[PDB]
Amino acid sequence: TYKIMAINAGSSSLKFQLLNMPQGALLCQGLIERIGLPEARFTLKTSAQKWQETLPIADHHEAVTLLLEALTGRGILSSLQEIDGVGHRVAHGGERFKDAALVCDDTLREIERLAELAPLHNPVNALGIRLFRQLLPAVPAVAVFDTAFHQTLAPEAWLYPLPWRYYAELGIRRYGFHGTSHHYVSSALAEKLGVPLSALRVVSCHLGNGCSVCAIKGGQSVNTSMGFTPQSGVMMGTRSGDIDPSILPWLVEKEGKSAQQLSQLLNNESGLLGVSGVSSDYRDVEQAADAGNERAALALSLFAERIRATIGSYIMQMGGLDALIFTGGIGENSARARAAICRNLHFLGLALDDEKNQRSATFIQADNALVKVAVINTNEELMIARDVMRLALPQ
Amino acid sequence: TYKIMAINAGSSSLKFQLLNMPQGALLCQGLIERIRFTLKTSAQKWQETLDHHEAVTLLLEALTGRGILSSLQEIDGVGHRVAHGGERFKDAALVCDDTLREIERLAELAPLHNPVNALGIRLFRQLLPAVPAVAVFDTAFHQTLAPEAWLYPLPWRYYAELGIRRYGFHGTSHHYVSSALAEKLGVPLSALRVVSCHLGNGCSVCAIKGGQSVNTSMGFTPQSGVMMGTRSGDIDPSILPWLVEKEGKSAQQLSQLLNNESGLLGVSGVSSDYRDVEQAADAGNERAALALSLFAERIRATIGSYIMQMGGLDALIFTGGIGENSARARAAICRNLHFLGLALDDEKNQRSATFIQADNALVKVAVINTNEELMIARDVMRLALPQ
């Protein structure tokens, strides 16, 4: 039994879980939020209790100190020396990282060089890597990149039909995100089916506040809906996903939009929120729509259609489909979203068993369907913990 | 039998066809460039080298002079290609007087093409006052799209106030080859789930179910959708604000990027013409070989979306300059689709037979030559000569 800690460091937040490996048992979890601000809050939960306190938190250096102190102060560990490894989420690995990597000085050097591609995540990610290497210097660390799993994409899937200069010089290309989640629920599907993932043609739908679809064939990722940025792909909470690109020059000319206005538009004002006029939250739009809000209804309908269109592209690309996975907050819980997404797919041998779908059972395909349809809770922290074991305790 | 003239006014051009209706027989056809005037008949040709008013005068002088028509009053109708009819025109329209007003009030959406089309509609009204005119819109066929297909997931305001939505184009083409496919199969078009691929210098895919366009790949502008000769088609929209902050690209520069520099030309770095890129690929150019693959991939992914949306497929149509002549583009697009019962017969594809699917194949695959002018002439017959 090994103690692995999963770390996710945001601009003003510190998310953490502590897992007993390899069973994957949650020992504790929690969140430090509004770091550096007033309002700063530290929330920590065990299998048995919850503690929550508002208190000033200077910087991440003080967020990590309070976390480490709480681990022994609450009896969760007898000592900090019981921590066998730490896994850090990293937004963007570029083309350099095909896998998680043991944290060393140059792995840090490179993650920082990649800030130009994830400017609002990668540096704080590396700061967490640095603080824990300072504060827990005897503990080995692994960086786990949200892009790594998509690096098996072939060029005809990641190259945009732009002038070659824009890839070769500027680095513009599809990278895709949610890699850890798609990777985790891919492997979990195959284990639950008792079949090697390399034997399956799989489409995975991560439907949360962020949404992405991924195609997995031969155990590798062969396409995914997010592109150069997590803005793109299907429609999400506040993100538009893919739109006619020629809309954007037209809004610059006709409405005098700055570069950042365009990006606030694409990332914060659109999606469920921009269409429904109600909310970014799926439950809220559904509540509005069920009461008679036609824009909320169309919102939910457009949302299912965008995902259906992406699924269709990837089935075509793989020449078939053996299984469809739903995950994330919407995918794990919304039997109605799953039903709207899965309707009228007899041409694939895909249909849902309504009783199992309403229950969000782990398998929900109809009895005589040829396509397995799985509802799998995603667990990026467990996946991260598994990558720590692999690269930092080969034992 | 009736005599109908089809017209296409470009910003520096004027194309024409004069058909015997409803046979389809061509009486003459030609083109005027550099506003060079060419006029071909069944058995003659007549090029020369000399504003759009002068082009209409000479063209109408020619039909009497070269002996194609004994009088300018033998023309029963004229049809005019219009580029963008917004939401107002769900069909072709008899050119009464404020049909013209509304074509021009829409010129803000098709800045380069609509005014020139309307210009040519007016001149023919001047010079040919006795013969009725029908306008045929590249957008009208796609006005059957449901809101799930034409609303971008942008704030509602951007549509309800500014008019941003999918329109789609190549409507006249998709409509023509759809109906031709159904006529060749002896079945109502509404009996078929059809994917139509117009692959020319411009490229669009269209889904026709129950007789109607239910989706199509171009959107607000003819820039988007699949990869084209110099147009990028769809890309990650976040690339654009990034290009403004990192390279100071203006709006018009962004337009030039997406429309003039991308596509087969940008990727291959060789040519916007598919046959050129093809030959550079055979010789060992690797960007050109990758351009050809991206091109087939982008079209395959769109087809997949539309098949999913229709619940199946009965026929796949290839049309346009590339789609009618490139066995390679069709083969690259059609590979490993057995899960649909779609496969090609190599020998039929090599000679571009009108049907190229394998014999065991469930899906019809058809190569149909587009004929927008005959589709326009038919709308003139329906809307101006209902007898």
**Distance (Å, rounded) from C-alpha B289 to C-alpha B268?**
7
Nearest CA in chain A to B252: A249
Judged by CB atoms closer than 8 Å, whether chains meet at B245 and A260 is answered as yes
Residues pairing with A19 in the sheet: A4, A26
Cβ B317 vs Cβ B368: under 8 Å: yes
- Residue B265: partners with Cβ closer than 8 Å, 6 or more residues away: B229, B230, B271, B272
Pick among B224, B258, B308 to test the A interface (most A CBs inside 10 A): B308
User: Which residue of the set A59, A146, A284, A387 is catalytic?
Assistant: A146
Buried b (16+ CB within 10 A) or exposed e, B206-234: bbbbeebbbbbbbbbbbbbbbbbbbbbbb
Q: Count other Cβ atoms within 10 Å, centred on residue B289.
A: 17
Chain A CB contacts of B259 under 8 Å are 246
- Tell me how many degrees the CA angle B257-B201-B228 measures, rounded to the nearest 5: 45
Query: Which structure tokens are listed for A181?
Result: 């989640």
Q: How far is the C-alpha of B84 from the C-alpha of B139, rounded, in Å?
A: 6
A161 with B235: Cβ contact below 8 A: yes
Residue A175: φ, ψ to 5°: -105, -40
Under an 8 A CB cutoff, do B339 and A348 touch?
yes
3 state SS for chain B:
CEEEEEEEEECCEEEEEEEEECCCEEEEEEEEECCCEEEECCCCCCCCCCCHHHHHHHHHHHHHHCCCCCCHHHCCEEEEEECCCCCCCCCCEECCHHHHHHHHHHHHCCCCCHHHHHHHHHHHHHHCCCCCEEEEECCHHHHHCCHHHHCCCCCHHHHHCCCCCCCCCCHHHHHHHHHHHHHHHCCCHHHCEEEEEEECCCEEEEEEECCEEEEECCCCCCCCCCCCCCCCCCCCCCHHHHHHHHHCCCHHHHHHHHHHCCHHHHHHCCCCCHHHHHHHHHCCCHHHHHHHHHHHHHHHHHHHHHHHHHCCCCEEEEEHHHHHHCHHHHHHHHCCEHHHCECECHHHHHCCCCECECCCCCCEEEECCCCHHHHHHHHHHHHHCCC
A235, A306 Cβ separation under 8 angstroms: yes
Query: Are the beta carbons of A262 and B246 separated by less than 8 Å?
Result: no
Nearest to A16 by CA among A5, A27, A2: A5
Q: What is the dihedral of CA A184, A186, A191, A192, to 10 degrees?
A: 110
**Residue from A158, A159, A162 to probe the interface with B (highest B Cβ count within 10 Å):** A162
Q: Cβ neighbours of residue A343 under 8 Å, at least 6 residues apart?
A: none
CATH number for the domain harbouring residue A207: 3.30.420.40
Rounded to a whole number, what is the distance in Å from the CA of B179 to chain A's nearest CA?
24
Nearest by CB: A271 against B147, B153, B294: B153
- The CA distances from residue A345 to A314, A365, A372, B200, B308, in Å, are 14, 11, 13, 32, 7
Quote the CA–CA distance of B300 and A207 in Å, as a whole number.
24
For residue B294, which residues of chain A lie inside 8 Å, CB to CB? 156, 159, 161
The C-alpha atoms of residue B267 and residue A160 are separated, in whole angstroms, by 9
Total Cβ atoms within 10 A of residue B310: 22
Give the one of A156, A245, A262 whose C-beta lies nearest to B297's C-beta. Answer: A156
Euclidean distance between the first and final Cα of chain B, in Å? 11
Chain B nearest-CA distance from A60, in A, is: 29
For residue A167, give the amino acid letter.
Answer: Y
Report the alpha-carbon distance of residue A324 to residue A231 in Å, rounded: 23
Distance CA B381, CA B2 (A): 9
> How many angstroms separate the CA of residue B17 from the nearest CA in chain A?
33
**Which runs of consecutive H residues, i.e. helices, occur in chain A?**
60-73, 105-113, 122-135, 155-158, 165-168, 179-193, 247-255, 259-268, 271-276, 282-291, 294-318, 328-333, 335-341, 354-358, 380-392
Provide the shortest C-alpha distance from residue A93 to chain B (in Å): 18
Q: Is A13 left (phi over 0), alpha (psi -120 to 50) or beta?
A: beta
| Neighboring chain A residues of B223 at a CB cutoff of 8 Å | 244-246
| CA–CA separation, B84 and B49 (whole Å) | 32
Both structure tokens of B43: 């058995």
The packing angle between helices A247-255 and B251-260, to 10°, is 160
Nearest-Cα distance to chain A for B15, in Å, is 28
| The token pair that represents A52 in the structure block | 């929550």
A83-90 vs A141-145, strand pairing mode: parallel
What distance in Å separates the CA atoms of residue B162 and residue A89, rounded to the nearest whole number?
41
Q: Which domain holds residue A270?
A: 179-375
d(CA A368, CA A366): 6
The type of residue at A9 is A
Q: State how far the Cα of B178 lies from the Cα of B173, in Å rounded to an integer.
A: 8
Nearest CA in chain B to A318: B336
Rounded CA-CA distance B149/B164 in Å is: 13
Mapped onto helix, strand or coil, the DSSP state of residue A235 is: coil
Q: How many Å apart are CA B305 and CA A311, to the nearest integer? A: 7
Determine whether the interchain pair B236/A160 forms a contact, defined as Cβ–Cβ distance below 8 Å.
yes
Is residue B66 within 8 A of residue B46, CB to CB? The reply is yes
State whether the Cα torsion B352-B354-B357-B358 is positive or negative. Answer: negative
For B151, which residue in chain A has the nearest alpha carbon?
A: A302
Hey, how many other C-beta atoms are within 10 angstroms of the C-beta on A258? Answer: 12
Three-class secondary structure of residue A376 per DSSP: coil
Q: Do A309 and B307 touch (CB under 8 A)?
A: no
Q: How was this structure determined?
A: X-ray
Cα–chain-centroid distance for residue B135? Answer: 15
Distance CA A279, CA B168 (A): 30
Hey, CA dihedral for A385, A390, A392, A395, is it positive or negative?
A: positive
Query: Angle B97-105/B114-127 helices, nearest 10 degrees?
Result: 160
Measure CB to CB from residue B239 to each of A228, A267, A308 and give the nearest one: A228
Collect all residues of chain A within an 8 Å Cβ-Cβ radius of residue B293: 155-156
Name which of B149, B156, B238 is nearest A274 (Cβ-Cβ): B156
Question: How far apart are alpha carbons B212 and B155 in whole angstroms?
Answer: 28
